[PDB]
Structure formats: C-alpha cells, structure tokens
Amino acid sequence: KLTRIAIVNHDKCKPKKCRQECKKSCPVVRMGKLCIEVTPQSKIAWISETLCIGCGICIKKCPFGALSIVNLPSNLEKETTHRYCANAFKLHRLPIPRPGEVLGLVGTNGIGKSTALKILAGKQKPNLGKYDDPPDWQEILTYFRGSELQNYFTKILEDDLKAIIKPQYVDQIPKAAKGTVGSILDRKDETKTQAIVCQQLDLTHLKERNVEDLSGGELQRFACAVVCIQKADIFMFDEPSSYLDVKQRLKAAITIRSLINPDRYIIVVEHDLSVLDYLSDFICCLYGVPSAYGVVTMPFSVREGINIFLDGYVPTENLRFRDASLVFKVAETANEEEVKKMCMYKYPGMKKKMGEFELAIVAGEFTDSEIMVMLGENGTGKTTFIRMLAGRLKPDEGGEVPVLNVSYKPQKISPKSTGSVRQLLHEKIRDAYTHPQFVTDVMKPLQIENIIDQEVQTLSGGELQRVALALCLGKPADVYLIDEPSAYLDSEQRLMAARVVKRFILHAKKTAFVVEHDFIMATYLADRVIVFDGIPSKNTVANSPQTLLAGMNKFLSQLEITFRRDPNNYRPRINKLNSIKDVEQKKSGNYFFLD
Amino acid sequence: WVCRKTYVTPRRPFEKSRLDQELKLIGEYGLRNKREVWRVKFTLAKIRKAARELLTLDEKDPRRLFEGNALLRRLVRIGVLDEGKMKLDYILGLKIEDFLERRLQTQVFKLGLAKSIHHARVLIRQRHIRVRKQVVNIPSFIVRLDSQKHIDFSLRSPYGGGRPGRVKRKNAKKGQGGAGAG
Amino acid sequence: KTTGFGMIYDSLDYAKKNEPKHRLARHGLYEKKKTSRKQRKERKNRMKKVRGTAKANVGAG
Amino acid sequence: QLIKNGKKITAFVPNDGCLNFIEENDEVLVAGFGRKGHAVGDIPGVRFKVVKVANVSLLALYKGKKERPR
Amino acid sequence: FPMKQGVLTHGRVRLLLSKGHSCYRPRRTGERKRKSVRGCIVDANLSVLNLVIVKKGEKDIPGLTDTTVPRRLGPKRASRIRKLFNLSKEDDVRQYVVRKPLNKEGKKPRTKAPKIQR
Amino acid sequence: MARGPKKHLKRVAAPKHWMLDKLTSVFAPRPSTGPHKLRECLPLIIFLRNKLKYALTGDEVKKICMQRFIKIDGKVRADITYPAGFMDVISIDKTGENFRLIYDTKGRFAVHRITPEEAKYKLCKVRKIFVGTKGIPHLVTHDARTIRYPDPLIKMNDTIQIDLETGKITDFIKFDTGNLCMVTGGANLGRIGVITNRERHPGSFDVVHVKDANGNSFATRLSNIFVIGKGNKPWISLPRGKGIRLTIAEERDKRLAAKQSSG
RNA sequence: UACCUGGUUGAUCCUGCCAGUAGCAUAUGCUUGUCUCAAAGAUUAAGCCAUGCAUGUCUAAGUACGCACGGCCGGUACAGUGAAACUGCGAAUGGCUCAUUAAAUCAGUUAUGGUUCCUUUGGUCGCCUACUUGGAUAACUGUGGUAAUUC
RNA sequence: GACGACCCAUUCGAACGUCUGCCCUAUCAACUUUCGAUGGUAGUCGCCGUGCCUACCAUGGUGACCACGGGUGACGGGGAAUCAGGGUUCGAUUCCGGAGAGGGAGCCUGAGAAACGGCUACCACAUCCAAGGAAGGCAGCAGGCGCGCAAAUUACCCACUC
RNA sequence: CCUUUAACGAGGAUCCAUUGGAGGGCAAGUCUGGUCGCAGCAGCCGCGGUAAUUCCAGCUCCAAUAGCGUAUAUUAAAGUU
C-alpha cells in the first residue's frame, strides 16, 4: 500500500537529556539489527532508512517530540487510470481540469505528464488497469462516478468540449505535414486574434518567407499562433517554451494567458526556473520513479508549490526523499595544476551571408585547453556559421581549418537509424578512457543500461538529447561543437550533466563551443564569453570576445530583463519585466550578485 | 425509521422434543424455515398476553369492553375463532395450527386446485392465482374470511384463458423451425 | 389499473402563468438556460473581487 | 510488542504449520482467547492469540484459497 | 504605503481605522482594521507626490495648461439651476437644463437631460 | 444555539392539531407574529392544501394570495402565513364562500361554512381594562383589538360583538351563571355547556364548573372559558357534534350503524 | 415460557465458584440470487489542513444625463429595458461538535406588582423658502504608487 | 396605495428569581471571611431585583439528614436494551434545552452578539515575500494527512420542504 | 430503481448455498486411511505413549440457513448483592 519511515532532527533534539528512549523501546533494535544508533553524545540521534518497518512506537514515547513519521512512495495497485501492458509505465491519477485558471503541471522527466494530457484530450483513452476489454463510453464513466469527471467526460462525448494540444516534439513535423507560405496560415482561419498572436509574438519578419528557411524561433511561433487561432473549447500546451529566447518566452506565456478566463480549461507543462509564476495559477506536482510509475499530487498555489517541488521533498500530506539544490551548480570548486603549454590560434573576422541575412564575425582568441559560449538572441546567426567554417558552403574570402578532428554537436536532432541504439554505439567505441565517463553522466540514480537498449524512435526528449551528448565524446575528436544541450532537460538532469561535460573537455585537454539559452546553464559552463548582437533577418555581429560578466551585461542591457539571487539557496529568480528594484539592477547594470 | 423484529429464538438451543414438533409442522404446510414458524408463534403469544391482561381487569371496566369487542371481531374476521364463542376465555384455547389453516397455500390445497402442498406454493409464486381481482406472490397472505369465496386462478395464465407458456409455444415452433425448416 | 393526476385549464394563459416551468416544458414550449450548475458560483466569487466594472467577468472570465 | 503502548504480550498461534506463515518483524493482529482474563487450557502465561498476519486470515493461508502477498 | 494628514513624524505607523477616515474601505458595517500608513513630513523616501496647481504663472507649460478640456455635467437639482442662470422665484424652470449630446449610436444623436429633484 | 430570536419551527416540534404528516421534510410553516399565539393558530397555508386542497405546493399559495382573493377579518391579507385563530372569519368572495374557525369536540379547527350575513362580525372576549390618557378607557381582546369608549359595565371574561366594517362594538354578553360557554384550551376542548357554578380562590388558577345537556359535569380553568350566548341559546351558529364529547365505544356504534364510508 | 446442565469424591449429601445457554452492539473471518426500509470518523487526537463551494437581496412605488440597448422626439418629476454605485434589510437563523460543566446543566412547578423586546396585528397622529430649504460623496471621467492583497 | 416616525397594547421571545429532584469517594471531617465570607445602613453601576460593587457597622453562614475536598472514558432531558413481579445497564447521536468554534482576553455594529463565514492583542502553530512587508483558522459540505481494532462521493439539483 | 410490457431466456453434467459440528455438557460415526504424548485438538471435563468414536484426511450424518463463525462491552440465567 505504501511506505513508512522515521525522521529525527529537531530544535533541541537532545540525546544528552532524554536518556535515549528511542534506542530503549524500538522493536528492531531489540531483535539484533541496529536501526536506531545513539549514545550520550554531542551530536544528533542517528536512525536508518532501510531497516525501519514503520510502527511509530518510538515517536509515542520519546520524551521530546523530535522524531516524526514519514511515508515513502510505493505502488499498491491503487486507482490505476492506465497501463500499456506489463513491465512498463503506469499512471494513477488524472485530476481536476479547473476552469478560469490555467493548470500548471510541474515533475521530473519520463513521469507521465504527456500521458495525462493524452487521456484528458480523449485521444488515448484510459485503460484503467487492465487490457482494456472495457471500453466503451460506459464502464469508465461508471468507475469515476460520484465525482466530477462524469460531467467532464459526458460533455467531451458529446464533443461539447473540443480538443486541441501543442505537441511535445518539433521534428516529425517539420516532416509529417507541409506548409504553404502565407496562403497556409491564411486559409488556416480567421482574423483579429491571429494578428494579435503574430504581432504580440514579436516576430514581424516571417510574413513574406517560406517555412524551410526558418528555424526554432519561426517554427515555435507559427505553431503557437495557429494553435491559438484554432477555434476550439479546450486547450493544451506541452512543453511550449523549449529552445526559445528568454525575452520571447515571456511574451509566449502572456499570449497563452489571453485564452483563460470565461469558463475555459487550460493545461500547461513546463520545466521552469521561476517563470511558472506567470504561466499558471494552480501548480500540480508529479512524483514517482522515472519510466516505472508516476503519481499526481493534488494541486497547490504556485508560490507554495514551486519551492516544495525544488525544496527537496515536501509532504504532509504524504512524503518522499531526495530533491534539493539544483537551480545552479553550487558545485564549489576550482583550480588545477600548471597548465602547460597551450596556444593562441586565432579565427579571423569573416563575413558571411545566405539570402535574407547579413552575418558578420569579429576576430578572437580561441585558447588551448579552455569554454566558449554563444547566445545571444534567436536568429543571431550562430549555428549555420559553424557548419560554414567546417565544410558545407563558404568562404568567398579566407578562413581557418580545424587543427583537431572535430566533434559535432547538432541541435536539430531527429535522427533515423533503424535497428537499435546499440548498433550505433559500435560506430563510436566503449573502450578509451574506460573508467566511468557515460557512466559518470548517469548510471546509479536515474539508470541507463537505460540508454541502450530499446528503439530511438520511441525514446523521449531528454534521453534522446543524451544520445546526442554521447555522440560527441565518442568518435575520436577534440574540439567540440554543441548547440542547445539544455533542450528537453530539467534542472535536475541538465546541471549535473553540464558539469560532467565541462569536467571531461577541460581535464584531458580539449575546447568547446556551447550554444546555451539556460542563467544556470549559461553561467556554470562559461568563460568568454562571446556575445552575438543584432536584429533577426537583418544583421548579426559577434561582439569581439570579452569578459562572462561583461558579455552577459551586453545581452541583458539591450533586453531589458534581469535576475535576482534567492538568498538562502543561491538560486536564480527572474524579474517581472518592470519593477522597483528592477531599477537598482538596471543602474548598477549588475544582473548577478555573489561570485 | 421504525423497525422491529417479528420473531424470537428458543431459549434452549437443542432439545429432541422441540425439534420434532417444529420439523413435522413444517412438513405439513411446506414452510421453508423455522423463521416462518416462530413468526406465527410470536403473534400468537403476543395475543395471549393482551388477553391475559383483560381477564384480570374489573368486569365492566370501559377499557375491558371496548378492547375485547373490537379484538374478537378481528379474530372472527380472519376465521381463527367463531362467534358462537365470542368471549375472552376462548382466546387461550386458540393455538398455533388454526392460523396456518388460513394461510394462502393451505387454502389453495384444501379448497382448490393443486396436487401436494409443495406444488401449491409454486403456483402462488409463478403468478397463476388471484384474490378477487388482484395477483399475489405471497403465500403468507393470511386470508380474511370474506375473501375465501373469491379465490380463483388468474385471468392471464395458461391455466384458464390467456397466452400459453414458453414450453408449449417453443414446441409449436419446433413444428416450423425444428422439423418444418430445421 | 393505473392512476394519475390531471389538470384542465380554461385558457392557455392561465396555465402559462401558473404552471411550474418543467411541466410546461414537458411537452415543449419552454426550455432552460441557464446551463448546468457550477459555472454560476465560480463566476460569482470572481465578480465579488472587482468593483465598478464586472463586465469582463460576465462575459470574459 | 504493541504499536500504541510499546509493552509486550505473549500470544498463541493456532493450527499446524501456521507458525511458518508468521515471519519475524512483521505486523500481526491479536485477540483474547475467550475466557476474558485468564489463561486457557494447559498452556500457562498466554492470554492472547493471533488472527491476521497482514490483512489476510490464518484460515485462508492454512486452507490454501489465498497465498502470501509478498 | 499612502500618506494622510495629521500623522506627524514620518515613520510608518499602524493606526486603527474605521469609516470616515482616510485609507479605509469597509467590507462590513462597524468594521475596524489596523493598517499601516506613513507620515506627512516629506523626505526623499517617497515614490511619487501629487502637486496641485494653485497659482498660475506668466508662462504656459506645454503639456498641461495649453490643453483645454471642458467640464461635463450641469446640475441635476432644481435650486442649482436657479442659482446658476440667476432665475427669479417665478419663472418656472423647464427649459434651462443642460442638454448632453449623444454623439453617435448609428441611429441618430440624442440629447440627454437629467431629472430635476425638488 | 440561540443569541437572538428563532425563525424556524420543525415538523415534529409543531402542534398536533394542524395534523401534520412525517414524510414531507424536516421544516413546518411556523406562523409569523400577529394577534394569535402559535399553540392556538391555524396558519393560512395549512388551510389551503392540508384541508381544502385547492393548492398542492407552497408556491401555488404564493401565486394565489397576491391576487387578493383572500381576506381575513374583512381586511385583505397577502402572505403565505398569517396567524388566524379561534373566532375569525376567512372570506373568499370569488367562490362566494365564508368559513369560520371553531373547535370540533376532538379539539381541532374544522370547516364551519356560514352565510355571508353571519360573516360580518365575530365574537371577542375582553381580557383587560386599562385607563388611557385624559380619562379615556380602553378594551383589550384576544384578537388584540383596542376598542375605545366601551359601555361602562363591560368587564373582563365578557364577550362583545364587533362589526368588522366599522369596529366600535354594537352589543355584548355579560358573564353570568347559566350562560352558554365554549372551551378554548386545556384537556377539555370543544365542549359546549352552561356555566352552572363558579369557584374562586384568592391567588390564581380559579376554576369554572360546566354542565352540558347530556348530563355530565366537568371543570376547566377560568382562562380557557369563552362565552357564546345566553343559556341554551348561542348567539353564533354551531357545527355538527355540538360539544357532546362521545366516548369511543359509542363512536364505533354510529359508524357500523349507518355503514358509512361510501356514498 | 416465572426453566436450568457439566466439573472437587472410592461413593453420597452440601457450601461455592468456574464452564455451558439466550438477547443486545462494535470489531473481524468466510460466504452471498431477488425485493423494500437505511445507520455510517462519536469511541482515539475539541489533532492539523491543499483546492472548490456553503448568504445574499428590487417592486407600479428610495436614488438612473452608464458616451449601455432602445427611441419614432422628447425630458418640460419624465420612458421602455438597464450593468454599476449610494440607501434600506438580512448575515445573532440554520448547520456542526460534546471539550468544559455535579444543585451546575436540566426537568416538572411557579414569578415579574423587579424588567427589556426588531417585527406583526390593533389603537395613538393640530400649540427675497413653504408652489418645497442647506452642501457633499460614489458610480462616472482622467492621472498613479507598491514584489504582493476583496490594498 | 407605498414608505417613515412617537407612545400604548399584542406577538415572538429574552433575562433574572421560587419549590422539589443527582453518579463514585471519609486512605477528603470540619469548611468559609477584608484577597466579601453572612447580615444591616447609604451610595455607585445595570434593562431591572440583588454584596453585583464601594463606604461605614455588626459576627455571622454551613456540616454525620455527609458539608467541604477529590474523582468521573459525566453535557442534561424526552428515551433505548434486557425483563414474571421488583430491577439492572446504557443515553456522543436526527426532538427540546445548554456550552464552544486553535488556546486566552478585550471590543465595534445592531433591537438582539462579548459574534469568530466581525475586529484587535498576546500565546501555540502555519503560509507568501523583491525581506521593505502581507495574509490565515474545515468541531459547515466534500476531500487529505495523522491516529488507531474502527467508519462513504473533491457526485446531481432548488422541483419538493422551508 | 420499482411496477408495466415486446423479443430471447432451465433437463440438472448446470441458470451450482454456504457456515460450523458429530466423546459428554448438546441435536449427529465404539466407519476407513495416516500420525503415535510427536504434531495438534480442547470455553469446561479431557483426547494423543502404534487397535485414537475427540488429532490430520476420505466417506456418511447433524444444526441453522442468505446467512453462519470468532473477539469484546453489557443484560437475563444470579434468591451468587
């Protein structure tokens, strides 16, 4: 049914004035195995996790109310809204789609969030244990009788609530559908709202341009636009804020916020920093084990829910384990040996062009055994430049050829290699620096073994991103080209993986061109920063490379947007466009505090 | 709301003498359980208690007159007592078996059309009888005296006028799809 | 046997005035809307938290 | 040992081979013998017996219409 | 935190407030809350101030005093019309009301008037 | 619960002479304040759907009373509940019907239809005499009318005929032995008989013997007696039953004699 | 139905308790076709609580210059329909719990000639302004502050 | 016709006061008093009567007919289970009366409240925050955690009854 | 839902009645196999030490029956308050 365990530290939990009744009257510490370990001492009482059967006897006759009782998460065939079959993922609860507010849905990766949306949409209908010899619009309505979802599902039947979703992935599509320029979006539908959507989407650029010439930005934009302009009753946004600019993301959240108020239901996902404050008004957290079981907790207020999700484990109200610092790198460390020797290369100030783009580079120092960070706004000319330097098109005048072999990290990842991932891992090698490495990205807590086997076709975003992360330190090459690793990863998985990537390429002597849109992702991974400046579909200047601080200040001076440090935990928190203090930071120009 | 029991259990759990009487009584009338017996004996012992009061009350007390007069009418109206008696002393001469004569299944068998008593209970339940104009399904009708000359079969049944059953009309369709087209 | 209860009005308008609504709509000439239940209360509490202008919430959510 | 007092009680186990269906350091449910204070039969010092191991009866474990849930 | 009168030195003080005082809205009759407010005496700790023009100077500031907006409404009461247009007691007011134009409605323009009282 | 006055009365708390059931819901009507007391009232709506059965639901009575077909004491009332009690006249002028509220020998408010000529007045007991300002007297009655300048020999426990049209009583009865009386409360209720004797105690709770024309003597408190007219000669119309107060045995005999439950 | 039976001894008669027996109400095991009625987080923690909802209210008849709808043209109490806002009234009723509480609570009986009472019902209604007096607030219009509030 | 207002009566009550009625315990037998205990006189206060309170004065009041003290898994009653007669045991719980809304105290409004779906403060908790501040009380219906041997749907609806 | 009514709907193998007990108290086996003071049963009295009417099983039988068993509070039995 569930799990139970004891917890011990408290304000004057005093093992030096209680005689220690917890050790004296615990059944486990009597049959031989020391569950509770304590003495008359200066520290705290120690209590194990694994050996505690549950009971609560120690709690009822500890002389100080220091020891409380937690209950750890476990499956016990309870609710069970659906399963695929056996030895496979299952979900228990899909809960209230409260109207007039937007419902924010916030859990680790591979937990069933997307699956809950599929069920809510009426498309993949729920199976509820079994196997699923009951459907049909009767038995499930009888099962969730006495509640609410009877009224919801009967209104769906009858298609009184019309379904729309923004899909999780880009790739299969710009591949599965096709799009007539202008005409397409045009004979989409209808008026004033599309003009509001495309204009408040802050694009003004792709009105006269074919889809195939566009990138992430354009794609997402058009997508959201059409989705909204789509005359319907319900509305779902899965993952709407991936691989988009920081300024542009805020103006996406408020265009979503337009649809909410007058008896309409709305479900959003997301893996946020502190922008979820403007996305949603109810936050609903999901827990469990990645790719095994997922449980949805009942919804909370956004402020209250946010911290309790990143706090490290908030229950009351249940309970769990893990969860804590991750909104950064707090990986206090630095320094090396003597670094000898090195070089000074240097790449020249090339001028590049395509058709509707004037793209310019400035000369800079690309140091041996050292990171380089690219940004800067969407459309600011970063990716196609790197391909043009390596070999694809260019140059008209001059260039520098790579001294070292080359590792290509791609951003447009939707690969097609039929058979298995294990077959593709043989085009790399699993003997080299054989001591952990892929195993040091992930193995013990989230599992890999988890990265082999299975098909790449059915693999989810962050795991698919990890396939690409492996494909880079896996052919023999030492100069690394990486665009957007923060794509489809959260905070828990991204920050540790990013620190591991930096440790590899710095320690055995390499250089990597990282193209992050993540404060935590960009910062802890930065040095030079190089800054890209200029307006989309016009002009791109890579600013002559300067200081992490000075380059980040150039990016945020033009945009007009800033961050605050969470003072207890060292965590970033975005500002609300225009505030009070949002004026001291603008003047002090300082957008980072506490180096 | 308001509920109460209609029977009581015996004080002794077992007693060779008692069990034979309860068994052989159930055999005669086709009763399902002892709960159908003790039910009768609760009502009777209740009536035997009320009577036992009024005999000790003063003769020509107004309470004693009005109760007895309207009581004995009810005992005569169901026909467990005669009006050639008509006094309270004969209440105590009343006993268990006289009631059971006025049960529906007993009156079907005794004064109507049945085989053995075990048959007659089935006819009551399978809706082949009526009481004056009204179908019944309860063999515990206990039947008022006036209504004994209106016990008849039902007016929609294969017993008397009305549509046949599904054993006959089945076999009729065996002449048309069992040997007429099959 | 079956037993019911019947009215007979002298004119239409005497029925149409007096008559509980569902009995008139029983053989149609009236309906209901209105619209289910709930959408009323959640709007009411939102209207409560504005002053002067509540025309957004009445149409607008 | 009990949940809500932490004090100790010595409890009989019924029919043959039902001892095996009780495993150490699990929960159980106890109950008096049916004499309401006094030790019953030829066994001294025991005033309690055992009925359910873990939401499952000693009967169904013994008879074989249920199995251990672990 | 708002500024009210009669709240000498400029600290932030929590006063009892009720109906008929600055910076209070009752949500129930007889209700009394204890909100914080801030003093009269001006410092540079303030976000914004409201200055009312009292005396008009020689010059005309371009964005305000050059702009001219007429006041909207005439009186609704009887005796204010009498005082305004300086009528006698006997003249029988019935045509001395302001007529307020409805500019458009896609039909025709109306001229509205209020309803006299007393 | 209480901190101020209550506004509900349930089914089972309510009196038994309104003859309420128990399979309609928890609440009962509760009469609103007026001249009569709630253990002596017949609320209006209980007359219209638990007696006469014109109405069937409380919402129907709300649609009826608004039309102003109802009167009570010659004036017009227009609410679901009004606390009419003993000796008042209801008047529906559309049907041409007039009722009177009076007691059965059972002790409950019956239907006592009457001529419209009879329904132009009612009989009212005097309860208190009170000298007002500047040498003016007053009366006080159980229907709570204050009638100024009465005749100066009328005293409490007398009864007076009031003309509903103009007030200002025309005539009266004087409380005397051998006059005919009706009971209005207590264990004896609805019995009619002459006074016969009085009994006085200095203090309170004086009693009043009564005897009827069936040769039975009984007594009741003073303050439950109401005068109806001089000896064996009511100045009102009387219902069937007529205060005989039959035993239960004799009532059985009547029913099986006429054999009356069908027409 | 005002009822007893087994157990101290080699055997008998007592004293006496234990056990057997029937009802009732809580928990629990095993089993379960059809029909009606329906009790249900009191026992222990009057422990702690996410979210949603549970108290509002306009007639012919207090106040309509919403740039609202409408008009058949208006305003000369002046429309018909009318959001908002001031005003009147209710929110002290109900629902829930059993912690406190041993002449206290409470029940029967009595007392206001020791007092208060919204409301209803009935009475009470003449020792350069009166052809109608005085001056401000909301909605509304427009400009704002705060990370945030029915500010 | 509608509304409002002064007084009297009426209705719905409210508040004090009379007489009688109570479970276990003496390993609880003397208790109460200028920190008013009982009474007298005058005054204050209060809707009114009154040691309710204050000044002055007296020395009383209560108890083996069980006071005083302690205990109660004690809210009271209408009732319920068992029962030949007499009894015994139970009564949180649908009607009536009472008390209380996390623990204490104070107070506004009103005819009516020492109100908690009103307010202010302290104490115990717990929430948000840009750390400047702000907001809260499910023993209401559902629902969750905890506690235990032990107890239901975050359903539908003002048609009935009010 | 109930009542009312089309059309399908019973050959006993399934359109399947269980819960306890059979030495005495107390209604029903000095039947068959296994165990041998072991394992267990037993409110109580007592059963098991190789011929067990009481244990573990089979067959048969008995009681109540859509109910029956078990634990605990409490009344009757108790003229053992």
Ligand SMILES: Nc1nc2c(ncn2[C@@H]2O[C@H](COP(=O)(O)OP(=O)(O)NP(=O)(O)O)[C@@H](O)[C@H]2O)c(=O)[nH]1
């Ligand atoms: N075998 C199998 N597994 C599937 C299928 N669809 C989803 N899964 C698995 O179900 C788990 C969760 O899927 P999903 O809901 O997409 O996860 P997520 O929480 O959305 N992942 P992320 O946080 O990275 O965005 C994963 O382990 C995934 O592999 C399928 O068709 N077959």
Ligand SMILES: Nc1nc2c(ncn2[C@@H]2O[C@H](COP(=O)(O)OP(=O)(O)NP(=O)(O)O)[C@@H](O)[C@H]2O)c(=O)[nH]1
């Ligand atoms: N006019 C035009 N634009 C093109 C063509 N090919 C690509 N682009 C667009 O030109 C821009 C170049 O910047 P790019 O390096 O793609 O930006 P990014 O690194 O993808 N930035 P972001 O991820 O924030 O969206 C992109 O928006 C891309 O879609 C082309 O042939 N013509």
Ligand code: SF4
């Ligand atoms: S926990 Fe309670 S018991 Fe264990 S040590 Fe701290 S105080 Fe002493």
Ligand code: SF4
């Ligand atoms: S909880 Fe149960 S197990 Fe863990 S310590 Fe307290 S008692 Fe020992």
Ligand SMILES: [Mg+2]
């Ligand atoms: Mg996903």
